[PDB]
Structure 1
Amino acid sequence: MTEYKLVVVGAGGVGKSALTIQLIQNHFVDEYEPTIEDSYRKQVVIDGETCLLDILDTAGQEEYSAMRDQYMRTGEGFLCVFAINNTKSFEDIHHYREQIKRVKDSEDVPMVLVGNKCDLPSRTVDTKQAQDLARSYGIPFIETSAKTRQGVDDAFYTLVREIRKHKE
């Protein structure tokens, strides 16, 4: 039984809490909208193997978190979330990745660039410049919507595979 530590990073309001809940939710609770950072557990199967995912939904750069740096020491991979309708959230990705590289003293850190809210037709961040940013960091790019559940499982499963590929 292999565990995986995942950290969800991004500006405030990009949907990090909403993406993490849609993966985790067993739908016992109708709707649950967290406000405080927290960690959550989910069993998944990737390429034959069972996998326990610890998912930490961090607060944005706006909010203070005492454990912020420790979360990144613990994190094995990272979901970098912006919203495709907030251009500053896209520009903030450079800071969060730079912050990960500082705490982890490394560039080859398993990450996945994630452009949330793919349901809003007010698309300001083109898919092509998002893929370009992902190309420059050497990491996959996945489009998701925590509102329509699309891509949600694909993002997290991609991150776990990055961890696997990095491990060798």
Structure 2
Amino acid sequence: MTEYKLVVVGAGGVGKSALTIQLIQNHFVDEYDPTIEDSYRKQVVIDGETCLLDILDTAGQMRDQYMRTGEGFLCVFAINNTKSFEDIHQYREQIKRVKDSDDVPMVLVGNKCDLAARTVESRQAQDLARSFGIPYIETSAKTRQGVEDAFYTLVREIRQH
């Protein structure tokens, strides 16, 4: 079937794994479990199309190998962590440099929106997303708000590329 090679990137601890686990294993669980590299392959149906999501959940912390192979990128920061938002520029730049492309399927993800103590305003990330020509979607791995939204939108960006 059609396969979509999705890569989740972003600073350490923003909730990359948590987003992926919530998508594939329909659950969250608050716990500390740093990622080295993990692969989830799930047959889904998105907009009537049966497809295989091949998601690489990467380390925040050798990224050229996994980036090169990537079709679409979830670029994640956390709304309670200004550094991870500031770190967004570098991941996009590194993805452009390895993908030799101004325009790779990509979504900007503001995760942990369940949390009361916001330090990155939505307008702020919205303005940044617009300047990249990519969608901005806020998520909560905890409550699952926006999770399918983030990933399915990325799949849709890949289809429209």
TM range, normalised to the smaller chain?
Answer: over 0.9
Q: Matches of 1:123 and 1:145 in 2, distance apart?
A: 13
Q: Matches of 2:124 and 2:116 in 1, distance apart?
A: 17
- Is the 8 Å Cα contact of residues 28 and 141 (structure 2) preserved in structure 1? no
20-29 vs 6-15, greater mean Cα deviation: 20-29
Q: Matches of 2:91 and 2:26 in 1, distance apart?
A: 30
Answering whether residue 122 of structure 2 is matched by residue 127 of structure 1, we say yes
Q: Matches of 1:77 and 1:88 in 2, distance apart?
A: 23
Q: Which residue of 2 aligns with 1:97?
A: 92
Cα distance change on mapping 1:50 and 1:30 into 2, 3 Å: farther
SS at match of 1:96: helix
Identity %: 93
- Is the 8 Å Cα contact of residues 34 and 59 (structure 2) preserved in structure 1? no
Any runs of at least 4 consecutive aligned residues in structure 1 with deviations exceeding 4 A, and if so which?
26-34
TM-score, structure 1 as length reference: 0.90
Cα distance change on mapping 1:49 and 1:32 into 2, 3 Å: farther
SS at match of 1:142: strand
How far off its partner does 1:29 sit? 10
How far off its partner does 1:116 sit? 0.3
1:135-158 deviation per Cα after TM superposition (whole angstroms, max 9, x unaligned): 000000101000111111110000
RMSD: 2.1
1:110-157 deviation per Cα after TM superposition (whole angstroms, max 9, x unaligned): 000000000111111111011100000000010100011111111000
TM-score, structure 2 as length reference: 0.93
Cα distance change on mapping 1:84 and 1:30 into 2, 3 Å: closer
Cα distance change on mapping 1:95 and 1:32 into 2, 3 Å: closer
Give structure 2 stretches of 5+ with no counterpart. none
Give structure 1 stretches of 5+ with no counterpart. 62-66
Cα distance change on mapping 1:78 and 1:25 into 2, 3 Å: same
- Is the 8 Å Cα contact of residues 18 and 33 (structure 1) preserved in structure 2? no
SS at match of 1:145: coil
Cα distance change on mapping 1:49 and 1:131 into 2, 3 Å: same
Cα distance change on mapping 1:96 and 1:29 into 2, 3 Å: closer
Q: Matches of 1:72 and 1:78 in 2, distance apart?
A: 9
How far off its partner does 1:30 sit? 11
Cα distance change on mapping 1:133 and 1:23 into 2, 3 Å: same
